[PDB]
Amino acid sequence: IRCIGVSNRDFVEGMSGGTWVDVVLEHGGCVTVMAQDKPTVDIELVTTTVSNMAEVRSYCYEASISDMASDSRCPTQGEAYLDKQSDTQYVCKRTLVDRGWGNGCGLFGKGSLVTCAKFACSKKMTGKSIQPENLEYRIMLSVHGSQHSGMIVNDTGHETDENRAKVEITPNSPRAEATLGGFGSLGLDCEPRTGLDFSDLYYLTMNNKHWLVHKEWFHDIPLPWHAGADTGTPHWNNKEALVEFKDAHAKRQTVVVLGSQEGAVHTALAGALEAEMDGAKGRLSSGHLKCRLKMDKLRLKGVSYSLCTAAFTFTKIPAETLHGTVTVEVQYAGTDGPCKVPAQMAVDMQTLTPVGRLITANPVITESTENSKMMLELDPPFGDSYIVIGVGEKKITHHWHRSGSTIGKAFEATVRGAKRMAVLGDTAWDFGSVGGALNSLGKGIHQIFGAAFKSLFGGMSWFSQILIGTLLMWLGLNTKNGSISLMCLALGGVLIFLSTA
Amino acid sequence: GVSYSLCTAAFTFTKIPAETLHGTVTVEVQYAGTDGPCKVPAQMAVDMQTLTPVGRLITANPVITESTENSKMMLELDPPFGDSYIVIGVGEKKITHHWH
């Protein structure tokens, strides 16, 4: 239900006494939160709408040269000068050319020569500032139960119904309480100022395409620019980055414009993240949050209901959702209305012992009609298993085999934890932390390592990371001394940082 | 204003705060209430279920002065290094603000 088929779904379980759990909501990812006696609630960060942007230094990328002019002065007769040099919309450059009696002088030598050129930018790009107090994170919430595959497990959430909730997260309202009808309320305690460090990220505007341009990259662009606080003719500081004053044969100085720098800055933007803009607000498609989930008010609906009588029907044949969980759909045929489906996993079904755990806690049919659909989710153990979704002789079972093992599960969890550490950095220790002396000491020493690594190297590309990793590998394979752990921690910390892409 | 009582509810978060180049956060609030001389319950707290005061307060003993409907106030708090919340109320109608 809105998070069951996404490949970046992780499972967080267990709380500190059923009170709170700490989680990190990725922007492309989803988090499925399950508990013991509380219903399974899916979280999905959908958007990041940044409003109220003010402009910064806006660069030009397509220039033009108007009617140019040039004039020389005789040698030992002063320096050349024009009245059109007294405007800021004219670029110029002084040079020394040959001058003779065929050139009209009366003294042979290297006379001064000034060539003016009226600058006129046609199309310019714009950088905008991102304030950290203007982030608006939208969080979709959906609990597992009483849903179909149609308008209940899709994006139909533009209303106020049960089992679906949306909340906006500002820094002015960092906590939220989504109202789930019958299920209680999930308490969010998000920390939106600890996003993707938005004090050093700008917002580019070029050709109706937008990026999350880093600030230190944006402050060092060699292009003509004005300060952005102008609604007329711009001043265009540093006009000499797109014009070229080329002496042909020391007889005539021609000035030509350079080409449009659109493709030269699209190739220079090899590290920004593309965003969109739906007006004056900037919708992002990336980032991460930091939320604590108060789960004390989340209650389970449908525990007092009775069982179903009989007649379950197997429609929408179940498949594996790329993690080991099996989305199982049923069509219950009966007129009980509010009944409870006795769904369970079972190995060696003559004993009917529940062995595999269940994701959708307390599955409930709501509709009082004859044909009633339901969308479940079950996780089998590694080996042969049956899906018993009925009671009595009219149960329907399903032969299911989750391919894998326990140590393969732990190896895949180690790979997922390494990718989660390579994406988040310091915040990856608070993804399933319930509060302890190891998830706050490990996060502290990883914060020390991140502050000592992002300040030290901090600027390596994807290829240069592997290029210095080969050097650190060769320095780890030799120089047998006490400093061999420095050549292996900074080897793996760059190699897994560069290879997990 | 040590003899004043605490506030009841209904604060308003105007003038979204910032850092004054030293780690201090100057926070403006608008107490929507006619209680008069009440004392503002401001504290800096991580782990919002506990509300443990971790950061010290610069403007000691903040006091609402005006007895009208919307009495303004300007405070200053020193959060610790890391993540924190500016909890400037009591009860259930309190408003908070995350600060890093």
Partner: antibody
């Protein structure tokens, strides 16, 4: 109390130059920044120009930039809005706004004058 | 480029009811707004400093609020000696501050 008297009345002929002299007295006007707000008949208010606490600095609006220059005498606490190149769009009621400024141009409590009937007729 | 627009400009209401006047902005002016009170033929006064606190000699029946770039007035009881023209003012960054347009208040007759 708040006493911002204005002077320099009459009419402004097209092509000349006059001075609107605000006789500001009753406060320490060496720190109070001074402003000038129009009042167009039938339309809203217009912001014209202002003088900062420091003597050298002075700003105007973009529609009246380079035409109306002001001067403050610190020994007199007065203003002189030089009405150079007056066109037909200056038919309004000028005022004098004075407020305290820690920075260049700011006020927390504003003061006002009584107005000056300045029209253009040929 | 920040033009203070007022919506609405006239409300045919009775003295004693409420009145909400809003001033808008284009860029991100956070809170620094100032309302004014101008009777025709008299000197203009203010209404509220930072849309929350009035001047010396102005009662607390007139207040404002902050909502993004819009600032709505909250008037408890309208008096017949209070219907005049009201303006807004910019006090963000560097001047010239931009005034609104002028909001008059009409009565039934």
């Amino acid at each position: 109390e708040v006493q911002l008297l204005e002077s320099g009345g009459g009419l402004v002929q097209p092509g000349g130059s006059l001075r609107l002299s605000c006789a500001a007295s009753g406060f320490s006007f060496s720190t109070y920044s001074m402003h000038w707000v129009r009042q167009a008949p039938g339309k809203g208010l217009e912001w014209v120009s202002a003088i900062s606490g420091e003597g050298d600095s002075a700003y105007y609006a973009d529609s009246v930039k380079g035409r109306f220059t002001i001067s403050r005498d610190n020994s007199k606490n007065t203003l002189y809005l030089q009405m150079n190149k007056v066109r037909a769009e200056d038919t309004a009621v000028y005022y004098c706004v004075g407020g305290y400024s820690n920075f260049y141009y700011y006020y927390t409590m504003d003061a006002w004058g009584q107005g000056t009937m300045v029209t253009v007729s040929s | 480029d920040i033009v203070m627009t007022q919506s609405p400009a006239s409300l045919s209401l009775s003295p004693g009811e409420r009145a909400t006047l809003s001033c808008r902005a284009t860029q991100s002016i956070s809170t620094f707004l100032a309302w004014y009170q101008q009777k025709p033929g008299q000197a203009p006064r203010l209404l509220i400093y930072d849309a929350s606190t009035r001047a010396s000699g102005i009662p607390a029946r007139f207040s404002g609020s902050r909502s993004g770039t819009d600032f709505t007035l909250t008037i408890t009881r309208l008096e017949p000696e209070d219907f005049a023209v009201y303006y807004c003012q910019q006090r963000y960054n560097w001047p010239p501050y931009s005034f609104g347009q002028g909001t008059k208040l009409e009565i039934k007759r």
